Amino acid sequence: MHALVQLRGEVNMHTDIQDTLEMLNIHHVNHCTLVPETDAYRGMVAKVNDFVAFGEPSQETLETVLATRAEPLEGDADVDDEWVAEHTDYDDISGLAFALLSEETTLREQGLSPTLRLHPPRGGHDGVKHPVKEGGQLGKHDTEGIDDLLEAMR
Amino acid sequence: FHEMREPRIEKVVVHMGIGHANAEDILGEITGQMPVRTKAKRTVGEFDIREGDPIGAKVTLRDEMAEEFLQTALPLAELATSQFDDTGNFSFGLDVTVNLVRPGYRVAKRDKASRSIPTKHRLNPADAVAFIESTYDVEV
Amino acid sequence: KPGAMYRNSSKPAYTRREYISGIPGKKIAQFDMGNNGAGPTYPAQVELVVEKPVQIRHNALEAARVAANRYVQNSGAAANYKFRIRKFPFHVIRENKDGMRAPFGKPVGTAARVHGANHIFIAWVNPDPNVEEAWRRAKMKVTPTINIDSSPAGNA
C-alpha cells in the first residue's frame, strides 16, 4: 500500500492522466489517497508518475495523517480514536492504519472519504520539475521520504 | 538385390523435328504405330510464328515394339560415350532416343504417393553402357 | 551553393533511383587508394571519425579525400600505405530552382549520411603517421568537427 499525493495541477496535463487521478479519488492538488499495491493499481500510478508523489508510509505517519486529515464519507466529524471505534471495525486509529497498510480494508469500506486532503508542505517541498533521484519531489519515494512529505503536509 | 536393380528399356522416342507432315508415314512403318503431331511454342523468324502448329512428329515405343525397333536402329548407329545421359540415356540419329531405368520407376510415374527416384537407385552412364553393350554391339 | 543547404539529415531518405532520374554523377574519384594490391597487413591503423550526424555532398567527399591522399604523397606516388573512404553518397538532394508553388525541387546532387562516431576515412600505415597530418587537412573540408583516432598502434 502506497500513499498518493498529487503535486502538479490539471492545467495542461493529459486528459487520460487526469482521468486516472480522478479514478484514484484525487481531484485537487495536495489531495492524497491510499492505494493497494496491485498490478492494476500499479499501472495507474505509473501513468500518473510525473504529477504525483508516492511511496509506502510508516505506521506512525499514516496514523498522524489519518488523525489529522481523515474525514467521514460526509460531514465535518473529526476522525479520532473514538470515531474510529464507534464507527469502524477497529478500536482506534492505529488499528485502522495497520489494516490499511496490510491492505485488509479501505477508507470507503470504513465509511471514510477516500481522500486525505492534506495541507501545503510546511517548509516547501523539493520541486515539481524533477524526480526524487534528482532532488525533486516527483515519483516514488522512500518510506522515510514519503513520511517527511506527508508529515510536512499533516 | 539384383533382378530389381538390373536396367531395362522404357520407351524409345523416334521423332523427326521438321519445320512445318508427310514424314509421319515413314515413322509409322519404321516403328509400327501411329505418330503424334509436334506443335511448337513461341513465334520465330524461321516463318514459324504459329503457336499451335504441326512441325514434326514422334513415336514412343514400349516393350517389344521398342526392342524390335532397336534391333535395327542400334546397328545403324556407331557412337557411344559422351553421347550418353547422366541418367543412363542416349540419343542417336531423324532422332531415336532410348530411355533407360531400373524396375521401380513406376513409383515416379504414378498418381498416388508418387515419389522421385533416389540418386542411388538412378541409372548411371556407365551402368547403362554395360547393359546395352551387353546386347548386340560395342560401346565407344 | 553552401553546405548549409544540405548538411542536415532532416529529410526522408531519398535514394530510390527506380523513382528518381537525372541524378548527377559523383565527383569522388576513388575509394581505394595506395597499395590496394595489398591487404590491411599494416602495424598502424588510423581513422577519421565524424563527430555529428551530417550529410556530406560528394563535393566535400572529393575535396576531403583529394586533400588527404594528395598529401599522402609525402610517402610517394607508389608509397607503402592504403587509404579508404568507406562512405558513398546515396542520398539524392534537390533544390527548388513559380515560387513555392509546385516546389518539389529537381535533383542537383548527392550526399552521404554519416552518423556521429562512424569513421569516414581509414588509412593503414607502418610507424610513419604522416596520415595523421593527411586528416587534419581532410576534416578541414567536411562540415563536422572530427576525431582522429588510432587503432592498432601502441607504438607511441
Next chain:
Amino acid sequence: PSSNGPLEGTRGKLKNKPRDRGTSPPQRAVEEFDDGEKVHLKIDPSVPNGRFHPRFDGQTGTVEGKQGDAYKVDIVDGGKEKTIIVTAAHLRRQE
C-alpha cells in the same frame, strides 16, 4: 490517400508472409460457429471469397445467424453498429 478504393493502403494486411503463401487448409474454411460466439475477423490473403471490407480486419464481433454458408457477424465500427457478411475462412474463435 491518392485514391479511395477498398484496397487502398492494404498492401500489408492482405499479403502473406512468404511461407504462409499458397492455398490454405480447408479445416478452417469449414469451421462451424454458433449464434452468440465471439469471432475475430481477419482476411486470409490466400482465400479470395467470403471477404469483408479491409477496414474491419482486427474486429471481434458476434455471430448472429448466417446467410447461405456465409456468416453474419455483428460488429461496432467506432460507435456505429454494423453487420458483416463473412465466411469461416476469415474467422477465428475468440479465446
Next chain:
Amino acid sequence: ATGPRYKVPMRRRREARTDYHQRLRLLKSGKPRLVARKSNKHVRAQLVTLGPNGDDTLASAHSSDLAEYGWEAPTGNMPSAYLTGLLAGLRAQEAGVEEAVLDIGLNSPTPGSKVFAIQEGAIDAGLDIPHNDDVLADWQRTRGAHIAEYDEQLEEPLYSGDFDAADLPEHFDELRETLLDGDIEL
C-alpha cells in the same frame, strides 16, 4: 529447404496423398464422406466425419475381413469392392449413419470402376449417397462375370490353386445374400 522464404507444401501434399482442393469441395456438403480406397490386393471403405484434431472414422470395411463371412476368392476385384462397400455401408447404418458423399481420393472417375462399385454397395446397404447410376458397372461385371468369361478362355486356371477353376460369380451372390440379414459385426 532453400531459404527462409521457401514454401514447403502441406505434408499430405508432399506425400501426394491428399488432394486439398477436392477435399474442400467434399467437405462442403457437411455430410460424412465415404472414403473409397484401393490396394493392389485389397479394397477399403470408410465413413469419415470431421473432427477437432482430425477425421473420425465411424464405420469401415476392408476386403480382407470379407473372408470372415465366407469369402474364398481374391480380394482385389469388382465383386470384392462392391461387397466391402455393402459391408462398410451396413456397419455404417448400425452406427447411426444415414448419408454420405463419395470421396475417391486420387483415383479416377472411370465408369464401372471399383470405387463406384464401392459406392453402389454402400448405397444398397441403405446409405443415401449422391450418385449417378450409368457411371456404375452393369451388375454382371459387379458379380464378377467378366472374370468368369475370362477364365473360359482358359487352357490354364486364372487362379493359382485358389478356389475353383472356372471361378464363381455365384459365390458373390451367396455372400451378398449373407450380408443382407443378421450375422455378427453388422
Next chain:
RNA sequence: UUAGGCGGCCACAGCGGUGGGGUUGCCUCCCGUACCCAUCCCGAACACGGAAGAUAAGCCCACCAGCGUUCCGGGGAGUACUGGAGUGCGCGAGCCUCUGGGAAACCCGGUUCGCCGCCACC
C-alpha cells in the same frame, strides 16, 4: 501402427546422407491385357485381372546436423528505438536525466532429421 487408410498442425515436418525390414499375413515394386476404362502415339499413365519373383525403389523402423527451419542458454544489450515527465545541456543539429517498455544483425553452445487425432490390424 513387423510395413495400412483418413487426417489435424502445415519445414520442429524441408534438403542431403547411413543402417535395418518382409518364412503364412499388409504396402509395394512386380506379372499381365478377355473384359469396364484408357493414351491428340504408346496397358508409360489411367483402368481392369492377377501372384512367378523381389525387399533393389517406394514405404515403415533406427540414426547422422553439413544446409534450411523452430525454440532455448550465454554474449551482443538493457545497446538501437520508444510511451510519460523536466526553468537538465547544447549557437544549433541534437543530447541528457527520471519513469514505463525494449529489438535486429552476428558469434559461441544446446534443440530440431516431426508432433498429435480417429479407424483398421499377430
Next chain:
RNA sequence: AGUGCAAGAGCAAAAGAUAGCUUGACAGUGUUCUUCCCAACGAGGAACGCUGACGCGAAAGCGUGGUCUAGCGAACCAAUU
C-alpha cells in the same frame, strides 16, 4: 512463368496451360458492406442469399462475367420490351 491493361495483392494435382463441352455475361427479388471510417447523403460498385430456369461434373460442387481493387451518369423528353 502465366493470369488483357497501372500499381499493389492472390493463385501450382491452380486462379496458370492444353483439350472438350457450354452460354450463369440468365430472369426475378432481397440481405449487407461500400460509395460517405467514425457519422447523415444519390448514382455507381461489391460481397452473400433466396425464387425460377439452365451449363458442366460420378459427385460434393462450381458458374450472380474476366482472380481482387479503375472502365462511370439524376430529373424532364424520345425510342425500345
Next chain:
RNA sequence: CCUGUCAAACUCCAAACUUACAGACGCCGUUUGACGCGGGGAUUCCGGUGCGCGGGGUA
C-alpha cells in the same frame, strides 16, 4: 573467396505503441436515471500556438 556501402514507393527480422472483444480492479449510474431512443432550438464549417511525429521548402 576476400573486401567497401544503402532504401519514402526493399524486407529473413522487428519494437515502443495504437487498436477489436472479454474478465478483473477502479470510477460511475439505478430519488442526481447513467448507457440509449425520439423530438425542438442552435451556433459553426477564416482559426491560432506549444510539444511529439511529420511531408514540402535554403529558409
